[PDB]
Design a protein around this motif. Sequence first.
Motif, PDB file in Angstrom:
ATOM      1  N   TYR A 114      -5.219  38.870  -6.523  1.00  0.00           N
ATOM      2  CA  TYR A 114      -4.939  38.562  -5.123  1.00  0.00           C
ATOM      3  C   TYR A 114      -4.224  39.704  -4.413  1.00  0.00           C
ATOM      4  O   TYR A 114      -3.207  40.211  -4.892  1.00  0.00           O
ATOM      5  CB  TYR A 114      -4.088  37.293  -5.048  1.00  0.00           C
TER       6      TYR A 114
ATOM      7  N   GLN B 196      12.651  36.394   3.173  1.00  0.00           N
ATOM      8  CA  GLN B 196      12.249  37.225   2.044  1.00  0.00           C
ATOM      9  C   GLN B 196      13.110  36.952   0.819  1.00  0.00           C
ATOM     10  O   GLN B 196      12.613  36.980  -0.313  1.00  0.00           O
ATOM     11  CB  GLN B 196      12.318  38.701   2.432  1.00  0.00           C
ATOM     12  N   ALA B 197      14.403  36.696   1.023  1.00  0.00           N
ATOM     13  CA  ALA B 197      15.293  36.436  -0.104  1.00  0.00           C
ATOM     14  C   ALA B 197      14.885  35.176  -0.854  1.00  0.00           C
ATOM     15  O   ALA B 197      14.892  35.151  -2.090  1.00  0.00           O
ATOM     16  CB  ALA B 197      16.737  36.326   0.383  1.00  0.00           C
TER      17      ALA B 197
ATOM     18  N   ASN C  17       4.664  37.543 -11.824  1.00  0.00           N
ATOM     19  CA  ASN C  17       4.373  36.137 -12.101  1.00  0.00           C
ATOM     20  C   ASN C  17       3.537  35.588 -10.949  1.00  0.00           C
ATOM     21  O   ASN C  17       4.061  35.064  -9.966  1.00  0.00           O
ATOM     22  CB  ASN C  17       5.660  35.348 -12.308  1.00  0.00           C
ATOM     23  N   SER C  18       2.220  35.716 -11.080  1.00  0.00           N
ATOM     24  CA  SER C  18       1.273  35.191 -10.111  1.00  0.00           C
ATOM     25  C   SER C  18       0.203  34.391 -10.838  1.00  0.00           C
ATOM     26  O   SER C  18      -0.156  34.698 -11.978  1.00  0.00           O
ATOM     27  CB  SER C  18       0.625  36.312  -9.293  1.00  0.00           C
TER      28      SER C  18
ATOM     29  N   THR D  57       9.153  36.950  14.459  1.00  0.00           N
ATOM     30  CA  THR D  57       9.602  37.600  13.237  1.00  0.00           C
ATOM     31  C   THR D  57      10.469  36.642  12.429  1.00  0.00           C
ATOM     32  O   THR D  57      11.483  36.160  12.945  1.00  0.00           O
ATOM     33  CB  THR D  57      10.386  38.863  13.559  1.00  0.00           C
TER      34      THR D  57
ATOM     35  N   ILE E 112      -0.086  33.635  -0.526  1.00  0.00           N
ATOM     36  CA  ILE E 112       1.006  33.790   0.427  1.00  0.00           C
ATOM     37  C   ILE E 112       0.401  33.883   1.819  1.00  0.00           C
ATOM     38  O   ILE E 112      -0.550  34.639   2.041  1.00  0.00           O
ATOM     39  CB  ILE E 112       1.864  35.025   0.109  1.00  0.00           C
TER      40      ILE E 112
ATOM     41  N   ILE F 266       3.238  32.286  -8.357  1.00  0.00           N
ATOM     42  CA  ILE F 266       2.986  32.256  -6.922  1.00  0.00           C
ATOM     43  C   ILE F 266       1.491  32.404  -6.687  1.00  0.00           C
ATOM     44  O   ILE F 266       0.858  33.320  -7.224  1.00  0.00           O
ATOM     45  CB  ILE F 266       3.770  33.357  -6.188  1.00  0.00           C
TER      46      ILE F 266
ATOM     47  N   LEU G 133      11.869  33.789  -1.009  1.00  0.00           N
ATOM     48  CA  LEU G 133      10.614  34.022  -1.717  1.00  0.00           C
ATOM     49  C   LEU G 133      10.836  34.851  -2.974  1.00  0.00           C
ATOM     50  O   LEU G 133      10.249  34.569  -4.024  1.00  0.00           O
ATOM     51  CB  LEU G 133       9.610  34.704  -0.791  1.00  0.00           C
ATOM     52  N   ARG G 134      11.679  35.881  -2.887  1.00  0.00           N
ATOM     53  CA  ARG G 134      11.995  36.676  -4.068  1.00  0.00           C
ATOM     54  C   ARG G 134      12.751  35.851  -5.101  1.00  0.00           C
ATOM     55  O   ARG G 134      12.566  36.039  -6.308  1.00  0.00           O
ATOM     56  CB  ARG G 134      12.805  37.907  -3.666  1.00  0.00           C
TER      57      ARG G 134
ATOM     58  N   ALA H 176      10.390  43.330  -3.315  1.00  0.00           N
ATOM     59  CA  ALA H 176       9.910  42.111  -3.951  1.00  0.00           C
ATOM     60  C   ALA H 176       8.425  42.135  -4.282  1.00  0.00           C
ATOM     61  O   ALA H 176       7.932  41.180  -4.889  1.00  0.00           O
ATOM     62  CB  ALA H 176      10.212  40.902  -3.062  1.00  0.00           C
TER      63      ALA H 176
ATOM     64  N   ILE I 250       6.680  39.537  -7.184  1.00  0.00           N
ATOM     65  CA  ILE I 250       5.598  38.588  -6.932  1.00  0.00           C
ATOM     66  C   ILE I 250       4.391  38.914  -7.801  1.00  0.00           C
ATOM     67  O   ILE I 250       3.765  38.019  -8.381  1.00  0.00           O
ATOM     68  CB  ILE I 250       5.233  38.566  -5.435  1.00  0.00           C
TER      69      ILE I 250
ATOM     70  N   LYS J  80       4.023  29.437   2.281  1.00  0.00           N
ATOM     71  CA  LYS J  80       3.640  29.370   3.689  1.00  0.00           C
ATOM     72  C   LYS J  80       4.830  29.861   4.505  1.00  0.00           C
ATOM     73  O   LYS J  80       5.656  29.076   4.973  1.00  0.00           O
ATOM     74  CB  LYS J  80       3.224  27.970   4.079  1.00  0.00           C
TER      75      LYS J  80
ATOM     76  N   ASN K 102      10.950  32.517 -12.449  1.00  0.00           N
ATOM     77  CA  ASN K 102       9.785  32.325 -13.311  1.00  0.00           C
ATOM     78  C   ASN K 102       8.888  31.207 -12.775  1.00  0.00           C
ATOM     79  O   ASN K 102       8.592  30.224 -13.455  1.00  0.00           O
ATOM     80  CB  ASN K 102      10.209  32.060 -14.758  1.00  0.00           C
ATOM     81  N   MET K 103       8.459  31.383 -11.529  1.00  0.00           N
ATOM     82  CA  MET K 103       7.534  30.470 -10.873  1.00  0.00           C
ATOM     83  C   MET K 103       6.291  31.242 -10.459  1.00  0.00           C
ATOM     84  O   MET K 103       6.391  32.245  -9.745  1.00  0.00           O
ATOM     85  CB  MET K 103       8.178  29.806  -9.658  1.00  0.00           C
TER      86      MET K 103
ATOM     87  N   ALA L 297      10.286  33.758  -7.044  1.00  0.00           N
ATOM     88  CA  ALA L 297       9.573  34.588  -8.009  1.00  0.00           C
ATOM     89  C   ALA L 297      10.429  34.859  -9.239  1.00  0.00           C
ATOM     90  O   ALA L 297       9.952  34.759 -10.375  1.00  0.00           O
ATOM     91  CB  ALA L 297       9.148  35.900  -7.352  1.00  0.00           C
ATOM     92  N   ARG L 298      11.701  35.198  -9.030  1.00  0.00           N
ATOM     93  CA  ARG L 298      12.576  35.538 -10.145  1.00  0.00           C
ATOM     94  C   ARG L 298      12.997  34.322 -10.958  1.00  0.00           C
ATOM     95  O   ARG L 298      13.573  34.493 -12.036  1.00  0.00           O
ATOM     96  CB  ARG L 298      13.810  36.278  -9.637  1.00  0.00           C
TER      97      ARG L 298
END
Lengths: 212, 95, 133
Positions: B61, C96-97, B55-56, C90, C112, C109, C99-100, B48, B52, C79, C106-107, C103-104
């Motif tokens: 960063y 992680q899924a 699109n940042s 942990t 982090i 970021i 957050l990915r 991933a 990331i 966050k 079209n947002m 991202a996909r």
Amino acid sequence: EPFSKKEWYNVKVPKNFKRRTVGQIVVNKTAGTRIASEQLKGRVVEVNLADLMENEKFGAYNYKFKCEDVNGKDCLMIFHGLKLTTDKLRSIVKKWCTLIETSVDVKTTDGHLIRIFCIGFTSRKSNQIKKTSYAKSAQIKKIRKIMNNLITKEAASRELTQFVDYLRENKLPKEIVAKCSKVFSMDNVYIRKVKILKAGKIDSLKLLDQHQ
Amino acid sequence: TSKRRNNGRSKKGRGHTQNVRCSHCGRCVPKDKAIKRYQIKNIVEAAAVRDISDNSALTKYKLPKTYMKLEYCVSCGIHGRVVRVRSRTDRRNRL
Amino acid sequence: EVIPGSTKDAFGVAHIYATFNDTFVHVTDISGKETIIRITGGMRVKADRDESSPYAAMTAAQDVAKRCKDLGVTSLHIKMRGEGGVYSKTPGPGAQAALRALARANMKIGRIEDVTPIPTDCTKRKGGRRGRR
RNA sequence: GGAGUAUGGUCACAAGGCUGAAACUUAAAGGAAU
RNA sequence: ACGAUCAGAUACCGUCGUAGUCCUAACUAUAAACGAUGUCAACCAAGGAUUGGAUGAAA
RNA sequence: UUAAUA
RNA sequence: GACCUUAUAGCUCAGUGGUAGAGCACGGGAUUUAUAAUCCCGGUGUCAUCGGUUCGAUUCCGAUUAAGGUCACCA
């Protein structure tokens, strides 16, 4: 619809920072005995320092602001605290060195009472061969007393607004390293957190001086 | 009898050490006897990181890492493959 | 026309709290006192064992993303957090899924961060001397 | 092995602690290494 | 005290939870209280490193 | 996850 | 003695005006080196004994047995 009653207000930080608008904050529209400008009176906004200065050499610092009045869809913020980013704080703790921590309660010239936390680390040397670099209990107390006194002189002499902008300049961490180096080898000196124990008296004119 | 000269501990010139909690079992083990491992990983997996970065909203960063120290009891260090059972003559190797 | 209460390109912050038994996707404003949309991994599954599955994380994350775009929020601060009180720090697999997935969708970021609460010093942990068995 | 058991003495608010056998039973029990 | 698992489960797993865990005063005097190695003293093969000093050199 | 005995 | 209740597979129980269900038990087969546990299938009830209402009673109504619960007091 849940958001039919919601309003968005512009957020304004004092003139000390390069970026004046940091985002938008949401609040419900007014009601019988519920005024939004009255409700947006204890909201704390947390923003990174790499945004208020528009440079990413400030990225490992989080700044917090509180709202003091709503001046027509604008929330005029005042400084509320600063704190090291969590990743940076845990990235500077080496294993085979001595960690030096301190905290001071200083009353500023303009009346604000704040608490300042400082962290430090005994370092290696250019020609050092032995793995460990520890300090005796006598040297730790000498170093702590120095950074306790040195941080008080620089903070008590200046007001809260100008002291914060001083923290952006690396003069204080650089001066501590250059004055504790006659006792031990120090490399990393950071101010990990600054609180506000007692909020000093403020005026609208003083706030207006703080905001343009 | 004595499988290990140091009895499996790291305590030589003292009589007592504080306890720590196993990161997996929750067991109480002494600080020296615990199997201490350090972990430094990025907060974004290798798959991933590209997504990331595409699109940042920030210029350049740099992705932070996470740091935490994990302490395991003997039972949960062996079972979790943190450490393995070694040869009788290979036990002595400390590197 | 425009959805009531929505604005133009703004900033939000996503509080992705993913344990080993569930996962949370929760976006607020910069202040953090106003929540925009909160979707958990348990609302997109039927059985109780799949609330931690990575599939449920992206399904919840996509629903969060679609609502926020319709409400004007286009960029997010992440966050990341796990149940790190005294237990394992942990974050779970679904962290992680999600957050990915954001991202996909079209947002954009922003920053982090890991905000798992590490105790300066801790109360007694559940389990006893001999722990889980 | 019985057994740190019974009894006797002593200490303790109590749990217990200190001292502490015998009858009887048995060709082994045990230690390090292949 | 519930709920699971099991042939059963008074247990391991999960939830709640009293004495206890904490401080003060007084008892108790036991631990795999272990280096399973009593205290003192003499002689004693090659090393590298470390903690606290003293003493030369190298700032 | 469960796996007792000769 | 007087009131109340019950009786159903080999054992504990359900349900009951047109076909009696649950387990536990039993028999056979499968898994196992063998037993136990486990899986598959099957066989089991005079519905306590007599009368009557009964379309038709194991159910409804009386009777004879067993089995229990309560009372049996003032003198």
